[PDB]
């Protein structure tokens, strides 16, 4: 009842930029740079794979299998005997050989990397189990540094405490602080979304961004509590009528001229300057696109990259995804002639 | 269903609190003996916070007002969810290789032929054979898309400026044009999408 | 899989299967919406009844509208039964007892 919003910005705290809509706008954000979207999401996905317990019971049974190597309940041996020859061609023979090398390749995987629970790649064994209690899992998460991935875990680089070295207090600490600031800002964004979902004013007044300026009257506060109760929150008269908003927007978008442009001598519309197989057949050209031109050309040049068995990490630059896979294949093909 | 008679009959304007959509869902659930139709809507109304976007919005996912406008003008925005206060938007922008059916191996192989190859639907542009980024491509199904969910703080004159209105008027101005000079109905190239261009889906939220 | 290999999906079946403003506009322009009913104290939401020729049969879908001044002209010119309702003038008196409740 005590919340009142600014009447100029309607509780937003930001107005559309006076110029350009620049040196009067805000200072953009970290996620407007489209060139770093896939790198940012790749690092975030790599961080989230530590916490992800979607495959939890499967990795738990794998952990039990590698702990006690004395299992039972087989009850039928799989037949599964057809890796026919190193000869012939096609896709079936290649896929079948790659499927039949599964046991030796899994042994290689378990020798090079081992179980994720034995190397702290995942969260470990049963630490966070649902249906236990909200608070036992909180205690287990607060135990050691289970809330952080090992790339930001302080108990991994303390052995390098002498002279700093690889910047365990300047690079790992900076990365951990940036990660914590990002998750705290995510919580702030979620609180703002929750307040916006129920028509309430947002609690966190964020700085203006690259298309916005601060409000003239608030400066960015956009609302506040007061002794006087809101008579719009009371009596339900908080939101305008749809027809009234339509009439306001129609009158605002349709200015009229009450002077004929012959008595006043005006021959041009308002503004400065005054006197003066594309874009009409196909229509424009994308502007945010253009950094993916090389990847599109390479995907057209090599149709084998469209194979369903191939899954590149993703990216647009020379470093990452299609170009990385093509460079790896070319390096392998060049170095197999010398070996 | 609507409770619009309540004020003139009793004095209490029950239409200010009645939910006609929830009544309609309850009526349909009762008629079809399918209680999930009413229960899902009731649970979405009750547990609204748990319906907030918690996937694809990780760690300060704010773009800008200006970048949101640039992405909207480039038709790179798949969904625009405007919230109840009409001042905060969630911008679902697809991952670029998930924006259309290109056959890029970064995406999950949703679409494969019998040769187990990802299906590419990149029709060449006869007006720009040297610029593959101007070529035409069918957009992916939305349910198969991977989307960044950005947070945008809209200004208080967002509806007065009419940028969303101008984008909608640009999008709904063309499509399925009859051509008497050659017969047939023609979907014009202006009505088709480019390689990374998607159809913007504007959805508003009800605070009630 | 397909249902389990997005890693970004959030209510993909609850969002969708639900008319937005652009989809309602497309359905009206295709002549698939039988009736539009404005409801609420602000009349900013409609309960659109679609025809049997619509994709998905005949169903009732709730659409929240933006301030679009061409929507009513679109509905009228596309043969849609635009039903508003009551809208009592005295908002202060009408929305008083229900706010007390």
């Amino acid at each position: 009842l005590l919340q009142h919003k600014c009447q100029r910005c309607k509780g937003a705290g930001v107005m559309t930029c006076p110029a350009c809509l620049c040196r009067v706008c805000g200072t953009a954000c970290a996620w407007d740079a489209e060139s770093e979207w896939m790198e940012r999401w790749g690092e975030w996905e790599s961080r989230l794979a530590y916490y992800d317990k979607a495959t939890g019971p499967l990795m738990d049974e794998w952990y039990e299998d590698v702990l006690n190597a004395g299992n039972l309940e087989e009850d039928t041996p799989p037949v599964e005997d057809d890796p026919p020859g190193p000869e012939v061609t096609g896709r079936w023979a290649e896929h079948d050989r790659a499927l039949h090398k599964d046991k030796k390749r899994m042994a290689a995987l378990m020798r090079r990397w081992g179980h994720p629970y034995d190397a702290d790649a995942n969260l470990g064994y049963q630490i966070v189990d649902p249906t236990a209690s909200m608070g036992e899992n909180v205690w287990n998460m607060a135990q050691v540094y289970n809330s952080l991935p090992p790339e930001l875990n302080p108990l991994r680089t303390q052995h390098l405490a002498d002279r700093g070295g690889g910047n365990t207090q300047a690079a790992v600490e900076a990365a951990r602080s940036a990660f914590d600031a990002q998750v705290v800002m995510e919580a702030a964004l979620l609180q703002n979304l929750e307040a916006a979902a129920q028509d309430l004013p947002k609690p966190h007044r964020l700085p203006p961004t690259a298309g916005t300026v601060a409000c003239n009257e608030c400066g960015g506060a956009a609302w506040g509590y007061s002794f006087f109760p809101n008579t719009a929150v009371m009596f339900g008269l908080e939101r305008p009528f749809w027809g009234d908003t339509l009439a306001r927007l129609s009158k605002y978008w349709n200015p009229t001229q009450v002077a004929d442009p012959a008595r006043t001598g005006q021959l041009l519309p308002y503004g400065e300057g005054g006197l003066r197989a594309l874009e009409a057949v196909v229509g424009k050209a994308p502007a945010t696109t253009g950094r993916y031109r090389r990847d599109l050309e390479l995907l057209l040049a090599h149709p084998e990259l469209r194979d369903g068995a191939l899954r590149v990490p993703g990216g647009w630059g020379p470093e990452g995804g299609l170009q990385t896979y093509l460079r790896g294949q070319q390096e392998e093909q060049a170095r197999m002639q010398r070996r | 269903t609507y409770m619009d008679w309540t004020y003139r009959s009793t004095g209490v304007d029950l239409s200010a609190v009645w939910d006609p959509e929830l009544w309609i869902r309850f009526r349909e659930a009762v008629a079809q003996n399918e209680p999930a139709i009413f229960w899902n809507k009731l649970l979405d109304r009750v547990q609204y916070k748990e319906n907030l976007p918690q996937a694809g919005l990780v760690g300060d996912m704010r773009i800008s007002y200006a970048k949101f406008l640039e992405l909207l003008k480039d038709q790179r925005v798949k969904r625009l969810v405007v919230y109840g206060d009409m001042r905060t938007a969630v911008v679902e922008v697809p991952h670029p290789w998930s924006a259309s059916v290109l056959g890029h191996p970064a995406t999950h192989p949703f679409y494969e032929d019998s040769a187990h190859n990802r299906v590419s639907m990149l029709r060449p542009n006869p007006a720009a054979p040297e610029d593959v980024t101007q070529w035409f491509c069918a957009e992916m199904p939305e349910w198969d898309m991977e989307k960044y969910r950005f947070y945008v703080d809209l200004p208080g004159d967002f509806w007065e400026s009419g940028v969303l209105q101008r984008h909608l008027a640009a999008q709904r101005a063309e499509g399925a044009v009859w051509d008497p000079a050659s017969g047939q109905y023609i979907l014009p190239y202006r009505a088709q999408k480019k390689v990374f261009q998607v159809s913007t889906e504007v959805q508003l939220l009800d605070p009630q | 899989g397909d249902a389990n290999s997005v890693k970004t999906a959030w209510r993909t079946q609850e969002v969708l299967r639900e008319l937005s403003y652009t989809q309602l506009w497309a359905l009206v322009g295709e002549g698939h919406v039988a009736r539009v009913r404005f409801y609420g104290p602000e009349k900013n939401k409609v309960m659109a009844t679609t025809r049997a020729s619509a994709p998905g049969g005949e169903r009732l879908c709730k659409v929240v509208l933006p301030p679009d001044p061409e929507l009513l002209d679109h509905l009228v010119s596309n043969g849609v039964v635009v039903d508003t309702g009551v809208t009592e003038d005295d908002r202060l008196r009408a929305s008083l007892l229900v706010q007390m409740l």
Binding site: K53, A54, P57 | D144 | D2, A3, A9, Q13
Partner: peptide
Amino acid sequence: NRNSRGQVAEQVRAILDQYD
């Protein structure tokens, strides 16, 4: 239907529970 990560976790638990 497209499951979120939590719903994928529910699926994995249901599938790894069923027969028991």
